[PDB]
Amino acid sequence: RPLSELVERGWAAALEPVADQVAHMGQFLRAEIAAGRRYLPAGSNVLRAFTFPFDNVRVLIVGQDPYPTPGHAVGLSFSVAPDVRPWPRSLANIFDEYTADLGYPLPSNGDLTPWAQRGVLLLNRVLTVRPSNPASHRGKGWEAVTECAIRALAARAAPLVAILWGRDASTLKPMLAAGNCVAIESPHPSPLSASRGFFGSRPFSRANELLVGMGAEPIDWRLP
Ligand SMILES: O=c1[nH]cc(F)c(=O)[nH]1
Ligand SMILES: [Cl-]
Secondary structure: OOHHHOOOHHHHHHHHHHHHHHHHHHHHHHHHHHOOOOOEOOHHHOOHHHHOOHHHOOEEEEEOOOOOOOOOOOOOOOOOOOOOOOOOHHHHHHHHHHHHHHOOOOOOOOOOHHHHHOOEEEEEOOOOEEOOEOOOOOOOOHHHHHHHHHHHHHHOOOOEEEEEEOOOHHHHHHHHOOOOEEEEEEOOOOOOOHHHOOOOOOHHHHHHHHHHHOOOOOOOOOOO
């Protein structure tokens, strides 16, 4: 399939250099199913972050790998469907930092689509996972795809702030070395890393200050 059937057109053009790799991934995923190994999120959600316009991305959030529990991952990093409770621990931790930083009430639900509609790309370094097996698709080929995505964003040379959560930060910063790009890092919001530096990192206000510094408009982070 042409990438234009799977992703928004700006993203299809940006990712055309890795189109074969995306096709390779689809073959991998189908072979996993044939071998009895499922993946998450749903196939139609794998590339969901790339269905919001490439040309509108102002903030890139980059996590590690999708939630491994069935019913959680939706193809926007960290997000869940609006009916999901309890929220996953990483998301609950994100929302505590959100209230600490911004002073807003806790969100009504775990659905981050408003951020995606507002120019926040909710990416992961690796775009699939086998259920119950954290990080199990590492090294399977997503990395080249997400490197192309990140570099293509950087190459726009439009104001961009990248928020890097977790162990990929040192790998990803060189990909964001470009005019009008700034990368800020912390430990990941997961259960056993959040209290080692995620909390207190204030990414939402920081990203807005960095955007304004560059002459861009800040993100309205307010969730319903
Ligand atoms: O690194 C991540 N952890 C948890 C998630 F839900 C996600 O998308 N990314
Ligand atoms: Cl989690």
